[PDB]
Design an enzyme around this catalytic site. Structure first.
Site, PDB file in Angstrom:
ATOM      1  N   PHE A  81     -31.102  51.586 -16.942  1.00 31.52           N
ATOM      2  CA  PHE A  81     -31.490  52.614 -17.384  1.00 31.52           C
ATOM      3  C   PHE A  81     -31.622  54.028 -16.966  1.00 31.52           C
ATOM      4  O   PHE A  81     -31.808  53.905 -15.525  1.00 31.52           O
ATOM      5  CB  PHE A  81     -33.486  52.232 -18.101  1.00 31.52           C
ATOM      6  CG  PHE A  81     -34.046  53.552 -18.475  1.00 31.52           C
ATOM      7  CD1 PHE A  81     -33.936  54.136 -19.922  1.00 31.52           C
ATOM      8  CD2 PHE A  81     -34.492  54.558 -16.993  1.00 31.52           C
ATOM      9  CE1 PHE A  81     -34.663  55.003 -19.994  1.00 31.52           C
ATOM     10  CE2 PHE A  81     -35.712  55.532 -17.605  1.00 31.52           C
ATOM     11  CZ  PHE A  81     -35.245  55.946 -18.860  1.00 31.52           C
ATOM     12  N   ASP A 126     -14.291  62.427 -24.166  1.00 30.45           N
ATOM     13  CA  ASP A 126     -15.618  62.634 -24.576  1.00 30.45           C
ATOM     14  C   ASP A 126     -16.399  63.827 -23.845  1.00 30.45           C
ATOM     15  O   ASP A 126     -17.692  63.317 -24.138  1.00 30.45           O
ATOM     16  CB  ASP A 126     -16.324  61.979 -25.556  1.00 30.45           C
ATOM     17  CG  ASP A 126     -16.886  63.232 -26.489  1.00 30.45           C
ATOM     18  OD1 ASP A 126     -17.513  63.812 -26.968  1.00 30.45           O
ATOM     19  OD2 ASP A 126     -18.243  62.037 -27.578  1.00 30.45           O
TER      20      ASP A 126
END
Ligand SMILES: OC[C@H]1O[C@@H](n2cnc3cc(Cl)c(Cl)cc32)[C@H](O)[C@@H]1O
EC number: 2.7.11.22
Lengths: 297, 262
Positions: A81, A126
């Protein structure tokens, strides 16, 4: 790993296919992000590339894929996370700005992560602030590898429709048969400028608009600056010929070392554009440290 | 040029050399397969070659598919009636990984002649992914070949196509080729092509890069040379047909050398 050990906390994002949750491991305490991939063409190629490539890429500045949980109906990717993306951080730093020590720390880390990808024959394709994730300890990491690709040496022709437009390199815009590691550097250079100004460097609304925005900033490229440019598939001799700006006017708050680096990352000719590996040694980083973010995440 | 990634190619080659050892199938797996043989495998790969031709898939895609098949068969026993299902799933996964425009699943179901259903093909895709732990980014003969090509002076299209042709031939015959690494088959293929076409040999520059010499390559080179000499007689012929095409400079029409002088 198994879904019963995870307690969902809240939704934190979306893409495809495509929702991301913050969760916590009930047994270890570990906080994770769960990217759910809903499964008529079988497992999506984007998921296949993302998982297979991330399993090889273990680096402090690349988001860590912890586990893959693959029911028959569902595929869950378990990531470490990270609290925020760089875009949200820049928005939250408006009117104040991001302190230079942090901009320098983040760029240096991004370059380490990218150099590591390129050394493992991976193109990210990207890079944009939405896909760069930060934690409370001062780390920043490459994320969202769904558009990434394992390349060969020398490269072959790959997908033409790559990189979010604002961060897309001129060789992609001009339809070159081949593109390479230099396209990710172009993107980082745009990100570098954006960290300093908190606005996109080249915010075009179409491919041609995007090209003309780049040309008005860096000058319309000719054969001197970029051998072969007038021969490229989508080059037009009718392109307006804009003069190159004094680089100090592109990002005025940037010092000399900063300007030097930015200019080498935004070099027209992909062959001359600086590599991530070489950029690590740029004098801009002589005093780099790794402070925590100045704002709560 | 940046297309040849000068700042990373050495790191990349080093990385692929490490990965090929980890991604290697088990040399002896066929003897452990009760119901399939080297010859059934040969028929399968030859078919995959035809599929690749029909759909104009990249060669790399074909090499990946074979790697997936051999790794899968290294740990899962398969009945002869299911071997083609494994192969179809592998080729579908390789296409999704490697192709700009992979064929649709429907098209893969179609080329199996309705032997299997779409549901079977998709269920097998999952099993292959599970068996391979999603580890699909495997080094192939082709990835080493294209780097070795950068050492020609000057580049020669017949050399390059012939080397790829020889590399493909090796995919068909698990015996003996399962015992050699991709980088070694590629080195043997490159030397043999260079020698057949120009009379030149494995260059010093590649000894420097690879640490391989003609002495270390000899065992694979002797096998590859036999394979090249017997290719017109082989039961499987799809690769020879493929490489008659101008796309590959008709290299399969070239005559092998009678002797190597190694
Ligand atoms: O498709 C995944 C989407 O979720 C967003 N996201 C937000 N917080 C995140 C934390 C992590 Cl560790 C990840 Cl992998 C994605 C996150 C990503 O930024 C992306 O928009």
């Amino acid at each position: 790993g198994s879904m019963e050990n995870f307690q969902k906390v809240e939704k934190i994002g979306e893409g495809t296919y495509g929702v991301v949750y913050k969760a916590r491991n009930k047994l270890t305490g570990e906080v994770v992000a769960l990217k759910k991939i809903r499964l008529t063409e079988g497992v999506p190629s984007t998921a296949i590339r993302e998982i297979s490539l991330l399993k090889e890429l273990n680096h402090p500045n690349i988001v860590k894929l912890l586990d893959v949980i693959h029911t028959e109906n569902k595929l869950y990717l378990v990531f470490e996370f990270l609290h925020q993306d760089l875009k949200k951080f820049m928005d939250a730093s408006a009117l104040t700005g991001i302190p230079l020590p942090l901009i320098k720390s983040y760029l240096f880390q991004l370059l380490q992560g990218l150099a590591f990808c390129h050394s493992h024959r991976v193109l990210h394709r990207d890079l944009k602030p939405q896909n760069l994730l930060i934690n409370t300890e001062g780390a920043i990491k490459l994320a969202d590898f769904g558009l990434a690709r394992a390349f060969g040496v020398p490269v072959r022709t790959y997908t033409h429709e790559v990189v979010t437009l604002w961060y897309r390199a001129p060789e992609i815009l001009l339809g070159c048969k081949y593109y390479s590691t230099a396209v990710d550097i172009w993107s980082l250079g745009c990100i570098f400028a954006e960290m300093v100004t908190r606005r996109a460097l080249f915010p075009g609304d179409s491919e041609i608009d995007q090209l003309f925005r780049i040309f008005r900033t860096l000058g319309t490229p000719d054969e001197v600056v970029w051998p072969g440019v007038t021969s490229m598939p989508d080059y037009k001799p009718s392109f307006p010929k804009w003069a190159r700006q004094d680089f100090s006017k592109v990002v005025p708050p940037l010092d000399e070392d900063g300007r030097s680096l930015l200019s080498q990352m935004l070099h027209y000719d992909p062959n001359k554009r600086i590599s991530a590996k070489a950029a690590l040694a740029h004098p801009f980083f002589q005093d780099v440290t790794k402070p925590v973010p100045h704002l709560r995440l | 040029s940046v297309n040849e990634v000068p700042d990373y190619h050495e790191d990349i080659h080093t990385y692929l050399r490490e990965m090929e050892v980890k991604c290697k199938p088990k040399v002896g797996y066929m003897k452990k397969q009760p119901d399939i043989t080297n010859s059934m495998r040969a028929i399968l790969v030859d078919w995959l070659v035809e599929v690749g031709e029909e759909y104009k898939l990249q060669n790399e895609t074909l090499h990946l598919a074979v790697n997936y098949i051999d790794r899968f068969l290294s740990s899962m026993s398969v009945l002869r009636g299911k071997l083609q299902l494994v192969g179809t799933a592998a080729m579908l996964l390789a296409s999704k990984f490697e192709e700009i425009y992979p064929p649709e699943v429907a098209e893969f179901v179609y080329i199996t002649d309705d032997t299997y259903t779409k549901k079977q093909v998709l269920r097998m895709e999952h099993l292959v992914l599970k068996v391979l732990a999603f580890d699909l980014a495997a080094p192939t003969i082709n990835q080493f070949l294209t780097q070795y090509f950068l050492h020609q002076q000057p580049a020669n299209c017949k050399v390059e196509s012939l080397a790829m042709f020889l590399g493909e031939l090796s995919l068909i015959d698990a015996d003996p080729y399962l015992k050699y690494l991709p980088s070694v088959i590629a080195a043997a293929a490159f030397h043999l092509a260079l020698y057949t076409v120009t009379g030149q040999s494995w260059p010093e520059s590649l000894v420097q890069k690879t640490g391989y010499t003609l002495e270390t390559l000899k065992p694979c080179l002797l096998d590859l040379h036999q394979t090249y000499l017997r290719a017109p007689q082989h039961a499987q012929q799809s690769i020879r047909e493929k490489y008659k095409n101008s796309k590959y400079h008709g290299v399969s029409l070239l005559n092998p050398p009678e002797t190597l002088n190694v």
